[PDB]
Amino acid sequence: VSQVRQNYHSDCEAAVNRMLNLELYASYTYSSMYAFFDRDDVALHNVAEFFKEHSHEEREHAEKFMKYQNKRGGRVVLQDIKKPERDEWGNTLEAMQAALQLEKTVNQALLDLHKLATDKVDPHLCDFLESEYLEEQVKDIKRIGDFITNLKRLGLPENGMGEYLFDKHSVKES
Amino acid sequence: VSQVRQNYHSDCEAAVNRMLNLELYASYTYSSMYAFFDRDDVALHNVAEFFKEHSHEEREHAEKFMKYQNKRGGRVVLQDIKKPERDEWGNTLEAMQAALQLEKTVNQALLDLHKLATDKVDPHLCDFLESEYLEEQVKDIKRIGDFITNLKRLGLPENGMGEYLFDKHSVKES
Amino acid sequence: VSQVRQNYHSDCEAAVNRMLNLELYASYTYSSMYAFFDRDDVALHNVAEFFKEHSHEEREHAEKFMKYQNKRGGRVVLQDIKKPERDEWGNTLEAMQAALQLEKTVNQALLDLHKLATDKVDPHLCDFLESEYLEEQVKDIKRIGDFITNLKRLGLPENGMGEYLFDKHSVKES
Amino acid sequence: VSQVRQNYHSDCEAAVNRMLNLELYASYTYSSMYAFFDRDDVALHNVAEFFKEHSHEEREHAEKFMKYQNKRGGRVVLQDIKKPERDEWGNTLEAMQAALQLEKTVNQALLDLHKLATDKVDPHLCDFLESEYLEEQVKDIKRIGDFITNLKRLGLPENGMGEYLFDKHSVKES
Ligand SMILES: [Cl-]
Ligand SMILES: [Cl-]
Ligand SMILES: [Cl-]
Ligand SMILES: [Cl-]
Ligand SMILES: [Cl-]
Ligand SMILES: [Cl-]
Ligand SMILES: [Cl-]
Ligand SMILES: [Cl-]
Ligand SMILES: [Cl-]
Ligand SMILES: [Cl-]
Ligand SMILES: [Cl-]
Ligand SMILES: [Cl-]
Ligand SMILES: [Cl-]
Ligand SMILES: [Cl-]
Ligand SMILES: [Cl-]
Ligand SMILES: [Cl-]
Ligand SMILES: [Cl-]
Ligand SMILES: [Cl-]
Ligand SMILES: [Cl-]
Ligand SMILES: [Cl-]
Ligand SMILES: [Cl-]
Ligand SMILES: [Cl-]
Ligand SMILES: [Cl-]
Ligand SMILES: [Cl-]
Ligand SMILES: [Cl-]
Ligand SMILES: [Cl-]
Ligand SMILES: [Cl-]
Ligand SMILES: [Cl-]
Ligand SMILES: [Cl-]
Ligand SMILES: [Cl-]
Ligand SMILES: [Cl-]
Ligand SMILES: [Cl-]
Ligand SMILES: [Cl-]
Ligand SMILES: [Cl-]
Ligand SMILES: [Cl-]
Ligand SMILES: [Cl-]
Ligand SMILES: [Cl-]
Ligand SMILES: [Cl-]
Ligand SMILES: [Cl-]
Ligand SMILES: [Cl-]
Ligand SMILES: [Cl-]
Ligand SMILES: [Cl-]
Ligand SMILES: [Cl-]
Ligand SMILES: [Cl-]
Ligand SMILES: [Cl-]
Ligand SMILES: [Cl-]
Ligand SMILES: [Cl-]
Ligand SMILES: [Cl-]
Ligand SMILES: [Cl-]
Ligand SMILES: [Cl-]
Ligand SMILES: [Cl-]
Ligand SMILES: [Cl-]
Ligand SMILES: [Cl-]
Ligand SMILES: [Cl-]
Ligand SMILES: [Cl-]
Ligand SMILES: [Cl-]
Ligand SMILES: [Mg+2]
Ligand SMILES: [Mg+2]
Ligand SMILES: [Mg+2]
Ligand SMILES: [Mg+2]
Ligand SMILES: [Mg+2]
Ligand SMILES: [Mg+2]
Ligand SMILES: [Mg+2]
Ligand SMILES: [Mg+2]
Ligand SMILES: [Mg+2]
Ligand SMILES: [Mg+2]
Ligand SMILES: [Mg+2]
Ligand SMILES: [Mg+2]
Ligand SMILES: [Mg+2]
Ligand SMILES: [Mg+2]
Ligand SMILES: [Mg+2]
Ligand SMILES: [Mg+2]
Ligand SMILES: [Mg+2]
Ligand SMILES: [Mg+2]
Ligand SMILES: [Mg+2]
Ligand SMILES: [Mg+2]
Ligand SMILES: [Mg+2]
Ligand SMILES: [Mg+2]
Ligand SMILES: [Mg+2]
Ligand SMILES: [Mg+2]
Ligand SMILES: [Mg+2]
Ligand SMILES: [Mg+2]
Ligand SMILES: [Mg+2]
Ligand SMILES: [Mg+2]
Ligand SMILES: [Mg+2]
Ligand SMILES: [Mg+2]
Numbered sequence: 001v002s003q004v005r006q007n008y009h010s011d012c013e014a015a016v017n018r019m020l021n022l023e024l025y026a027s028y029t030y031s032s033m034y035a036f037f038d039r040d041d042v043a044l045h046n047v048a049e050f051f052k053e054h055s056h057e058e059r060e061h062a063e064k065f066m067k068y069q070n071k072r073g074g075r076v077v078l079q080d081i082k083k084p085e086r087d088e089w090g091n092t093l094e095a096m097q098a099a100l101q102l103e104k105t106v107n108q109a110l111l112d113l114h115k116l117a118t119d120k121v122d123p124h125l126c127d128f129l130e131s132e133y134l135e136e137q138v139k140d141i142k143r144i145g146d147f148i149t150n151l152k153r154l155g156l157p158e159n160g161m162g163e164y165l166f167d168k169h170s171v172k173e174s
Numbered sequence: 175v176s177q178v179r180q181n182y183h184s185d186c187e188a189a190v191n192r193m194l195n196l197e198l199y200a201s202y203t204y205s206s207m208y209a210f211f212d213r214d215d216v217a218l219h220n221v222a223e224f225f226k227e228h229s230h231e232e233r234e235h236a237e238k239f240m241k242y243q244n245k246r247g248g249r250v251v252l253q254d255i256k257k258p259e260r261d262e263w264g265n266t267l268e269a270m271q272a273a274l275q276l277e278k279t280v281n282q283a284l285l286d287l288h289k290l291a292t293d294k295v296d297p298h299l300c301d302f303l304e305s306e307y308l309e310e311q312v313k314d315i316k317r318i319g320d321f322i323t324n325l326k327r328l329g330l331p332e333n334g335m336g337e338y339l340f341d342k343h344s345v346k347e348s
Numbered sequence: 349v350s351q352v353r354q355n356y357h358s359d360c361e362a363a364v365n366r367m368l369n370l371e372l373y374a375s376y377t378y379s380s381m382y383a384f385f386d387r388d389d390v391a392l393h394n395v396a397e398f399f400k401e402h403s404h405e406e407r408e409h410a411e412k413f414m415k416y417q418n419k420r421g422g423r424v425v426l427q428d429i430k431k432p433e434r435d436e437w438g439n440t441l442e443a444m445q446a447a448l449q450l451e452k453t454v455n456q457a458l459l460d461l462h463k464l465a466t467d468k469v470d471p472h473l474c475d476f477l478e479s480e481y482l483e484e485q486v487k488d489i490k491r492i493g494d495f496i497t498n499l500k501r502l503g504l505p506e507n508g509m510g511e512y513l514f515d516k517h518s519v520k521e522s
Numbered sequence: 523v524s525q526v527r528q529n530y531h532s533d534c535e536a537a538v539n540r541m542l543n544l545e546l547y548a549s550y551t552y553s554s555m556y557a558f559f560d561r562d563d564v565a566l567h568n569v570a571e572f573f574k575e576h577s578h579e580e581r582e583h584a585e586k587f588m589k590y591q592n593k594r595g596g597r598v599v600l601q602d603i604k605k606p607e608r609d610e611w612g613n614t615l616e617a618m619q620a621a622l623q624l625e626k627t628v629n630q631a632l633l634d635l636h637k638l639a640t641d642k643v644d645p646h647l648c649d650f651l652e653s654e655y656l657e658e659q660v661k662d663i664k665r666i667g668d669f670i671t672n673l674k675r676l677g678l679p680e681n682g683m684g685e686y687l688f689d690k691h692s693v694k695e696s
Contacts, residue, residue, distance in 0.1 A: 104354055111355055114471045130475040138472055142419045145352040146217035153334035162335055169342045178388045178667040180626055181633055202429070209414045209424040214352045226411075233407070237400075240383045245664045250383040255376070255429040297636045298660055301652040391668035508675035509684055516691045 002073030009120040013074035015113050016065055016125075021079050022109050023062035026102055029084040030055035033099070036089045044167045047092050049174035054099075054140075061133070068128060092163050093148065093156035100144045107137045176247030183294040187248035189287050190239055190299075195253050196283050197236035200276055203258040204229035207273070210263045218341045221266050223348035228273075228314075235307070242302060266337050267322065267330035274318045281311045350421030357468040361422035363461050364413055364473075369427050370457050371410035374450055377432040378403035381447070384437045392515045395440050397522035402447075402488075409481070416476060440511050441496065441504035448492045455485045524595030531642040535596035537635050538587055538647075543601050544631050545584035548624055551606040552577035555621070558611045566689045569614050571696035576621075576662075583655070590650060614685050615670065615678035622666045629659045 030051045037048035069076050089095040110133050117125035150170055154162030204225045211222035243250050263269040284307050291299035324344055328336030378399045385396035417424050437443040458481050465473035498518055502510030552573045559570035591598050611617040632655050639647035672692055676684030 100351065107354055111471070115469065118471075126471070130471055134472045134475060138419055141352050141354070142214060145214040145350075145421075146219075148351065149215055149217040150338060153338055155335060159335070162338075165335070165338065169338075176388055176667075177622065177670065178663050180629055180663070198429075202426070205411075205414070206424070206426055209418065212415065212418045213423070214350055214418065214421060237379075240379070241386065244383065244386045244388065245660055247388060247667075249387070250380070251435060252376070252380055252431045254431050255372075257426045257428050261425060295637065297633070297640075297648070297652055298656045301656060388664060388667040389671055391671040393668075509677060509681070509687070512672060512675055512684075512687065512691075 002075075004071075005073030007122060007124070008072045008074060009122065012113075012117055012120055012122055012125055013069065013072070015116055016069050016074060017077045017079075019109055019113055020062050020065040020069070020076070021081065022106060023058050023065065024081045026106055027055045027058035027062065028081055029102055030058060030099075032084040032086070033089050033095050036095070037092075044092060044163070046167045046171040046174050047095070050171045051095070051099075064132060072124070091157050092166060093151045096144055096148050096151060100141065100148060103137065103141050103144060107134075107141065110134060110137060176249075178245075179247030181296060181298070182246045182248060183296065186287075186291055186294055186296055186299055187243065187246070189290055190243050190248060191251045191253075193283055193287055194236050194239040194243070194250070195255065196280060197232050197239065198255045200280055201229045201232035201236065202255055203276055204232060204273075206258040206260070207263050207269050210269070211266075218266060218337070220341045220345040220348050221269070224345045225269070225273075238306060246298070265331050266340060267325045270318055270322050270325060274315065274322060277311065277315050277318060281308075281315065284308060284311060350423075352419075353421030355470060355472070356420045356422060357470065360461075360465055360468055360470055360473055361417065361420070363464055364417050364422060365425045365427075367457055367461055368410050368413040368417070368424070369429065370454060371406050371413065372429045374454055375403045375406035375410065376429055377450055378406060378447075380432040380434070381437050381443050384443070385440075392440060392511070394515045394519040394522050395443070398519045399443070399447075412480060420472070439505050440514060441499045444492055444496050444499060448489065448496060451485065451489050451492060455482075455489065458482060458485060524597075526593075527595030529644060529646070530594045530596060531644065534635075534639055534642055534644055534647055535591065535594070537638055538591050538596060539599045539601075541631055541635055542584050542587040542591070542598070543603065544628060545580050545587065546603045548628055549577045549580035549584065550603055551624055552580060552621075554606040554608070555611050555617050558617070559614075566614060566685070568689045568693040568696050569617070572693045573617070573621075586654060594646070613679050614688060615673045618666055618670050618673060622663065622670060625659065625663050625666060629656075629663065632656060632659060 033051035034048050034055060036042055037044045037051065066076050086098070089098065110129055114126060114129050114134070117123075117129065147166075147170060151162070151166055154166055156163055156166075207225035208222050208229060210216055211218045211225065240250050260272070263272065284303055288300060288303050288308070291297075291303065321340075321344060325336070325340055328340055330337055330340075381399035382396050382403060384390055385392045385399065414424050434446070437446065458477055462474060462477050462482070465471075465477065495514075495518060499510070499514055502514055504511055504514075555573035556570050556577060558564055559566045559573065588598050608620070611620065632651055636648060636651050636656070639645075639651065669688075669692060673684070673688055676688055678685055678688075
């Protein structure tokens with residue numbers, strides 16, 4: 001047993017490792033989206049940079065779980081990071097829809113981890129999730145939903161001018 | 175009788191209370207418009223912020239009537255603030271048309287109060303309305319009319335790209 | 349269903365709308381207290397400004413619930429804002445006693461909403477209440493209790509000099 | 523006829539001269555109050571300075587009427603400035619009550635001049651009164667009413683401690 005360990009259930013330790021992997025998976029999917037929008041035959045560079053920044057955010061969130069694991073006396077166990085579900089992402093609307101689904105998948109895993117922490121009476125882990133993950137998750141889901149609404153308004157997928165305008169006005173100039 | 179009261183007719187005192195309520199009503203309608211444009215399935219955030227700022231303006235105008243009432247020795251009497259006429263506002267054009275009508279309703283009430291103050295020979299109340307309300311009212315009506323003209327030019331309600339562009343270019347970046 | 353909605357119960361959505369209304373109601377009551385203490389025959393201007401600032405605080409708290417509702421994919425539904433229970437507030441002690449009761453009423457509604465969020469296993473809503481409402485509520489209740497103790501010490505309601513001194517020393521100079 | 527004169531009735535010219543005299547009279551009354559509160563057996567120096575400043579304000583308002591008269595092509599005609607009604611002013615409450623009455627007397631004369639200007643269809647004179655006199659008059663009446671309420675609260679005339687405290691807290695430190 002780790003000398004620092006106190007009130008940390010084996011099930012929670014394992015679930016933190018699984019959440020670490022999921023964050024890395026999400027990061028990798030966002031990196032794929034970045035590379036797609038950077039292609040010469042796609043060429044939406046502000047959209048590309050949006051996804052690159054999100055990839056970096058998810059990687060940081062994975063690192064936070066590593067640090068958390070060690071703070072509680074658990075042990076980081078890594079698994080393969082699976083490649084993303086697609087090799088090409090269609091267009092800005094398809095990519096944003098996939099991003100929304102990914103953020104909701106990550107959110108569900110966070111909520112499930114909170115339920116486990118609650119069941120095992122681990123208020124430190126509950127606080128960590130609530131203070132570092134759950135609200136930023138809701139914000140990202142809202143942002144992407146707002147984007148999807150605007151992409152539909154702009155006539156995606158058919159309206160190329162609409163897609164061009166989204167890249168200039170909806171995502172930050174990079 | 176209030177020790178400060180001089181040349182202040184009971185009818186004007188009552189009409190100031192009614193105008194106070196109308197300003198609060200207008201504020202609440204603008205707050206509803208803010209919340210509508212902030213919805214994930216509407217997502218026109220500069221339009222939303224425009225209406226939020228107008229809600230704040232109307233609330234300040236209500237407060238100015240409270241202060242006025244007390245300065246003249248009248249007594250503030252509050253009534254329920256009725257909820258807005260609609261729960262959802264359609265789109266930017268429908269909302270701006272409702273805003274135009276609301277501003278003209280408020281303007282008519284101000285003009286009617288000026289007529290009453292004139293009838294009761296109350297130059298202080300006339301000056302207050304002319305100096306603090308009537309010109310800013312004309313400016314707001316002109317602004318909203320200009321917006322409606324541009325929304326029609328942009329092809330509202332059908333043209334979603336037009337609506338998107340209005341939010342980026344016609345209202346201030348928030 | 350809203351595309352952003354996840355783990356958000358209809359009961360919680362409805363209760364957030366009711367809490368929004370209660371915050372608006374509280375704001376309106378504080379505005380009435382402001383106007384009362386601004387009367388020429390009351391004339392306790394620092395007390396008046398204290399209540400004006402609290403009215404603004406409650407209005408901001410209502411707006412935060414609107415934003416919250418939309419972030420979760422719920423829909424803001426507004427109702428009439430009922431006028432305050434009294435048209436005149438007696439004196440500083442009576443007003444502070446009414447304020448204490450109002451803050452405890454709002455606190456109970458927040459605690460009841462937390463119980464509902466707990467029952468529906470909504471940790472995001474629990475965190476929102478704990479992080480944005482519950483502690484500031486306890487602070488406001490403590491502040492007003494402290495004031496009431498001092499008003500009694502100063503001989504309210506009978507001791508007019510005591511009431512005058514409270515306005516100069518206990519509430520911020522406005 | 524003055525080469526600049528246009529739309530300026532003889533009655534209004536005469537009434538402006540009478541208003542000039544009344545402002546000088548009011549100034550002189552406030553100077554008497556200053557001297558009273560500066561007495562070694564009264565010795566309320568912030569109250570004294572309040573009245574001194576008001577004397578200066580009224581003198582400036584008289585000068586503004588002189589300038590106005592000449593701008594319109596009327597002719598300034600001066601009369602004796604009558605001494606104040608009292609040689610001694612009792613205490614802070616009695617003096618403030620006399621000040622309230624004086625400000626309401628001046629206000630009535632301003633309102634009567636506005637009625638005359640209205641009857642003679644002189645919008646320039648109406649504007650001058652509304653823009654330079656009527657609102658500042660309402661503010662001064664409200665201020666003095668507020669003071670009287672507080673002096674009564676503080677137990678004037680009997681409560682000397684109350685009177686002492688008013689001088690320290692209600693009027694500006696001089
Ligand atoms: Cl353990
Ligand atoms: Cl334990
Ligand atoms: Cl264990
Ligand atoms: Cl593991
Ligand atoms: Cl894993
Ligand atoms: Cl593996
Ligand atoms: Cl596998
Ligand atoms: Cl996919
Ligand atoms: Cl693919
Ligand atoms: Cl997914
Ligand atoms: Cl889990
Ligand atoms: Cl968070
Ligand atoms: Cl957006
Ligand atoms: Cl957008
Ligand atoms: Cl009257
Ligand atoms: Cl009159
Ligand atoms: Cl009347
Ligand atoms: Cl009324
Ligand atoms: Cl009303
Ligand atoms: Cl009512
Ligand atoms: Cl009704
Ligand atoms: Cl409507
Ligand atoms: Cl509706
Ligand atoms: Cl209307
Ligand atoms: Cl009216
Ligand atoms: Cl104006
Ligand atoms: Cl325009
Ligand atoms: Cl425009
Ligand atoms: Cl849900
Ligand atoms: Cl869940
Ligand atoms: Cl549900
Ligand atoms: Cl509801
Ligand atoms: Cl409600
Ligand atoms: Cl209702
Ligand atoms: Cl009801
Ligand atoms: Cl009550
Ligand atoms: Cl009452
Ligand atoms: Cl209550
Ligand atoms: Cl509830
Ligand atoms: Cl808090
Ligand atoms: Cl205290
Ligand atoms: Cl205190
Ligand atoms: Cl002439
Ligand atoms: Cl003419
Ligand atoms: Cl003439
Ligand atoms: Cl003359
Ligand atoms: Cl004269
Ligand atoms: Cl003479
Ligand atoms: Cl004489
Ligand atoms: Cl006298
Ligand atoms: Cl005398
Ligand atoms: Cl007089
Ligand atoms: Cl006259
Ligand atoms: Cl003025
Ligand atoms: Cl005062
Ligand atoms: Cl005072
Ligand atoms: Mg060891
Ligand atoms: Mg284990
Ligand atoms: Mg494989
Ligand atoms: Mg937080
Ligand atoms: Mg985030
Ligand atoms: Mg995220
Ligand atoms: Mg996240
Ligand atoms: Mg009275
Ligand atoms: Mg009446
Ligand atoms: Mg109704
Ligand atoms: Mg004017
Ligand atoms: Mg103006
Ligand atoms: Mg305006
Ligand atoms: Mg307006
Ligand atoms: Mg207006
Ligand atoms: Mg949908
Ligand atoms: Mg429902
Ligand atoms: Mg009722
Ligand atoms: Mg906190
Ligand atoms: Mg607070
Ligand atoms: Mg509170
Ligand atoms: Mg609170
Ligand atoms: Mg000549
Ligand atoms: Mg003449
Ligand atoms: Mg004489
Ligand atoms: Mg006029
Ligand atoms: Mg003015
Ligand atoms: Mg003045
Ligand atoms: Mg004056
Ligand atoms: Mg004056």
